[PDB]
Every structure is written in structure tokens, then in C-alpha cells.
Amino acid sequence: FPTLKEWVGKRTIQQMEAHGYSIANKTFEGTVGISRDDFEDDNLGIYAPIF
Amino acid sequence: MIVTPASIKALMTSWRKDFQGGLEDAPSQYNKIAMVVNSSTRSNTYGWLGK
């Protein structure tokens, strides 16, 4: 609000302002691929922890 | 003699499906020369002892 000033004459009608700001969402992705043979021939269990 | 169109007369036939698989392939003879073994991994390792 406008800071108060000395009153001589009649009131000075002032004005203020409003600000705006916008942020847009984004889409992200990440993917990997492994063949069915490699995933099914893994008896060791080394490829299991991918999830 | 009920005069009949050729298209309608053609529909008066019976499906027989007796020639399916008529021409097969040559008989399998690999069972006289090879032995069937299974696998569950990228390869199969065979080992034996000497006399």
C-alpha cells in the first residue's frame, strides 16, 4: 500500500499493482531393454533387480 | 426340370476337407543317429572321466 504522506489540499488517488508468474509442467522418461533370451537364461539371478 | 442359375447351383456342394496334410515331409531319421538332450541356459557343458 502507498506509504502515508502529508495531507495538504485534497487526497491524491494513487494506484498499486499485482504480479503474476507461471510454471509449466514437463514430462520425463527413461527406458532400457533386454532380450528375452538373456533374461530367461539368467540362472545366477543377476538381472532381476532392475525394477 | 427346375431351371436354376449357375451361381445357386454351385452352392449345392459338400465340403470334404480330406486332402488336408496329404503331402507330408520325408520321415524323420535323426533319432537313429542323435540323442535328444534338454537345456535351460545359454549353453550346455558336458564332462566325463577317463578310464
Swiss-Prot record, chain B:
Please state, per the UniProt record, what induces or represses the expression of this protein. Answer: Expressed in the late phase of the viral replicative cycle. Expression of late genes is activated by the viral late transcription activator C.
Localization recorded for this chain is: Virion; Host cytoplasm
Locate the transmembrane regions by residue number: none
Q: Which residues form a coiled coil?
A: none
Query: How does this chain assemble?
Result: Part of the immature prohead complex. Interaction between the viral portal protein and the viral protease I may give rise to an early 25S initiator complex. The scaffolding protein Z and the capsid protein T should then be added to the initiator complex to yield immature procapsid. Host GroEL and GroES are also essential for the correct assembly of viral capsids.
**Functional note:** Capsid protein that self-assembles to form an icosahedral capsid, about 54 nm in diameter.
Q: What is this protein called?
A: Major capsid protein
What's the gene?
Answer: T
Parent protein range shown? 1 to 51 of 305
